Amino acid sequence: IVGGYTCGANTVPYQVSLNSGYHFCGGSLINSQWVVSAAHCYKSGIQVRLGEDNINVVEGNEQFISASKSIVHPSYNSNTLNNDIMLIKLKSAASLNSRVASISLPTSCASAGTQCLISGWGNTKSSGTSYPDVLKCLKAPILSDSSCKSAYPGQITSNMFCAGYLEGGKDSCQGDSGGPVVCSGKLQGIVSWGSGCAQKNKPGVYTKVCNYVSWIKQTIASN
């Protein structure tokens, strides 16, 4: 997260860290046994880390649970990043409390202008590299589809939306991918891609979760 603020420990209780010996992507807990992330974060041997603030220090509220199965969307295209979404089943159910909690799925798509919360452990610089150990947060609005398509000609599908600031300076970045975009208490987006981080006229692009609710529910019900 570039241009954000320190969330505060366990103030984003649905945020997860995907760990393969190190943090490599975020995700969101949608019920006691299932996480949603980005398909481009797929790899074998994932351990899901819940209840994290500092990812390098054991602070007392963590739950570390291995994945038993990963399901990448059937129509994911790694070249265009269309359908950049993936489900992960935990080997055992997480214990839900105030600091580890699920985020609701949307019943409606959010409109441009809605303010959302984006969070992650990704790079905090637009030029250079500095990775934080504690969770960072950014408040940002959904941009109009016209502005998004103007920023990224020929690249935006109906399964994506832009959020952030055309002036730049505030954005998601590498290492935030897979993490949540939450608006009015519902999961509306997944951190997917962009051209650099926090550059003028290049906002972040996010998977549009409301298009996938039926697939998520049907997949969870039968796996």
Q: Which two tokens stand for residue 187?
A: 């999961």
Query: 109 vs 54, 102, 119, 170, 212, CA distance in Å?
Result: 32, 19, 20, 23, 11
The one catalytic residue in 17, 23, 37, 84 is 84
Binding mask 37-76 for Ca ion (x = CB under 5 A): ---------------x-x----x-----------------
Active-site annotation holds for 84: yes
Block residue for tokens 């409301």: 210
Flag whether 57 is marked binding. Answer: yes
Rounded CA-CA distance 196/190 in Å is: 17
End-to-end CA distance of the chain: 33
Q: Is 167 annotated as a binding residue?
A: no
Q: Which is nearer to Ca ion, 52 or 176 (CB)?
A: 52
Q: Which is nearer to Ca ion, 66 or 115 (CB)?
A: 66
Amino acid found at 21: G
Q: Which residues, 125 to 164, sit near Ca ion by CB under 5 A?
A: none
User: Is 115 labelled a binding residue?
Assistant: no
Is the Cβ–Cβ distance between 45 and 88 less than 8 Å?
no
Q: Looking at beta carbons only, is 17 or 124 nearer to Ca ion?
A: 17
Site string for Ca ion, 85-104 (x = CB under 5 A): --------------------
DSSP β-ladder status, 86-90 and 63-72: antiparallel
The reply to whether 40 belongs to the active site is yes
Q: Is 56 known to sit in a ligand binding site?
A: no
Closest CA to 214 of 132, 107, 65: 107
- Smallest distance from Ca ion to CB 64, Å: 10
Q: Which residues are annotated as a binding site for Ca(2+)?
A: 52, 54, 57, 62
- Give the residue numbers annotated as catalytic, written as ranges: 40, 84, 177
Binding region for Ca ion (CB under 5 A) = 52, 54, 59
